[PDB]
Amino acid sequence: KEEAQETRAQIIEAAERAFYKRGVARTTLADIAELAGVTRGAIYWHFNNKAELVQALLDSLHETHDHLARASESEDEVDPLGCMRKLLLQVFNELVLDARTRRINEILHHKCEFTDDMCEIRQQRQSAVLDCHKGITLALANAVRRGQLPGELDAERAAVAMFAYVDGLIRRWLLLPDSVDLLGDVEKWVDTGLDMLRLSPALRK
Amino acid sequence: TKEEAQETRAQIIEAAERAFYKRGVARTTLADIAELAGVTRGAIYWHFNNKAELVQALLDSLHETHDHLARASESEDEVDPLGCMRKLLLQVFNELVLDARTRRINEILHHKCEFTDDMCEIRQQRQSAVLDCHKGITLALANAVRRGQLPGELDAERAAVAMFAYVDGLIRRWLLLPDSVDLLGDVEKWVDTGLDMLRLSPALRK
Numbered sequence: 001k002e003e004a005q006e007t008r009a010q011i012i013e014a015a016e017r018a019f020y021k022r023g024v025a026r027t028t029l030a031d032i033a034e035l036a037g038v039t040r041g042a043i044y045w046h047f048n049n050k051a052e053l054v055q056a057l058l059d060s061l062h063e064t065h066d067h068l069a070r071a072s073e074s075e076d077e078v079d080p081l082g083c084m085r086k087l088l089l090q091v092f093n094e095l096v097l098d099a100r101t102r103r104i105n106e107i108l109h110h111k112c113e114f115t116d117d118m119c120e121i122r123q124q125r126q127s128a129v130l131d132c133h134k135g136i137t138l139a140l141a142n143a144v145r146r147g148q149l150p151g152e153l154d155a156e157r158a159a160v161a162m163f164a165y166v167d168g169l170i171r172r173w174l175l176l177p178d179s180v181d182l183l184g185d186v187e188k189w190v191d192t193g194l195d196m197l198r199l200s201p202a203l204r205k
Numbered sequence: 206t207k208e209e210a211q212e213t214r215a216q217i218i219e220a221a222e223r224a225f226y227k228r229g230v231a232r233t234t235l236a237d238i239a240e241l242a243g244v245t246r247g248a249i250y251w252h253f254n255n256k257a258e259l260v261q262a263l264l265d266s267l268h269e270t271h272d273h274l275a276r277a278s279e280s281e282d283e284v285d286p287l288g289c290m291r292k293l294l295l296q297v298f299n300e301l302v303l304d305a306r307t308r309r310i311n312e313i314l315h316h317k318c319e320f321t322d323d324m325c326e327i328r329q330q331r332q333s334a335v336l337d338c339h340k341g342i343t344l345a346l347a348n349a350v351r352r353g354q355l356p357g358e359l360d361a362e363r364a365a366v367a368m369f370a371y372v373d374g375l376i377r378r379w380l381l382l383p384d385s386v387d388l389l390g391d392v393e394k395w396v397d398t399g400l401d402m403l404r405l406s407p408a409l410r411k
């Protein structure tokens with residue numbers, strides 16, 4: 001009884017450590033349960049499987065940004081592209097400063113395989129990125145129907161180009177941090193990608 | 206017979222690919238690639254010491270098709286080094302869509318290959334690879350610049366990083382949701398977009 005609003009968050013913290021150390025593919029619920037100090041039944045109570053745990057880690061990333069995200073995906077917001085700028089700067093600040101964000105991103109990008117003996121991992125990822133895509137595409141049209149935004153962006157493609165650049169930059173920094181002074185030059189990195197979204201003719205219809 | 210060995214390196218590699226693709230790199234070991242290929246046992250050990258070593262043989266095969274256009278791009282005497290960079294990326298994406306082998310080895314590289322302190326050598330290899338790749342995009346871009354094909358005050362290094370990231374995330378995006386990027390239909394649009402960023406971003410200058 002309110003036994004585990006608490007153990008849920010301790011099970012997720014042990015999942016991160018197991019996954020960060022041994023990787024997702026070879027970690028069993030039992031490694032995690034041992035690490036949390038609970039039983040595999042205590043885990044089954046919150047999660048029906050390892051894919052669900054992975055999900056919980058993935059989903060935990062959207063929290064911090066939620067507001068700037070939602071803000072920028074909204075007409076009434078006087079200034080969409082500017083919330084997208086803030087959002088992006090926060091995304092990079094949080095990767096640099098927060099060990100937790102970084103670790104979960106490291107697990108996501110470099111320690112979580114897609115194999116057909118658990119395709120809910122690849123499935124959940126597809127769904128996550130299409131979700132994120134609809135988001136970027138709104139933010140993109142709202143900027144456009146606001147003069148912030150060369151009236152003929154192909155949105156959908158601008159959105160894909162954007163996610164791609166931010167995604168590959170993050171994974172880049174994760175591979176070689178001392179080669180992307182991400183914190184020091186946050187603004188230049190964020191702007192570079194925004195300059196792509198408006199200054200590039202190729203992203204136009 | 207030397208020619209039999211060459212035959213059996215090349216079939217160790219073929220089966221590693223199918224092997225990593227279905228079961229992933231983490232839970233697949235040399236033993237299992239021998240049964241897959243139908244091989245002899247020290248054979249894979251003669252050829253391939255490790256697993257990191259075999260993984261690296263796959264990641265290495267990828268560059269082969271691009272050698273020519275990559276070399277020209279970075280040649281300080283080549284008259285159209287950005288044209289090389291352009292057509293190189295065209296061949297990269299063209300081959301990605303068309304060549305099943307390339308697509309699978311990339312899928313392995315991107316989606317079936319964990320970095321664990323448990324090896325080190327998979328991650329280490331990879332850092333080197335990307336640092337190497339980086340080196341070349343810098344020269345290339347630095348050649349396009351001498352020659353007034355890209356903005357004169359461009360930061361070559363930060364531009365090379367921007368470009369690598371875009372091409373890497375774009376490739377990964379397609380492997381994940383291929384029906385969301387007409388990579389083969391639009392190839393020139395995708396190459397073009399990334400290249401626009403290099404020539405038009407003022408944040409990439411100074």
Ligand SMILES: O=C1C[C@@H](c2ccc(O)cc2)Oc2cc(O)cc(O)c21
Pocket residue numbers: 061062065069087091105132135136162163164166167170
């Ligand atoms: O909505 C987001 C958050 C961001 C992100 C979330 C988590 C993470 O680990 C890394 C990046 O990805 C993005 C990438 C973009 O191009 C545009 C965006 O609006 C976003």
Ligand SMILES: O=C1C[C@@H](c2ccc(O)cc2)Oc2cc(O)cc(O)c21
Pocket residue numbers: 267268271275293297311338341342368369372376
């Ligand atoms: O030389 C290469 C190899 C290429 C590549 C892409 C995908 C892949 O799976 C393997 C290699 O990436 C590049 C990206 C560039 O901007 C410039 C380049 O010169 C290169």
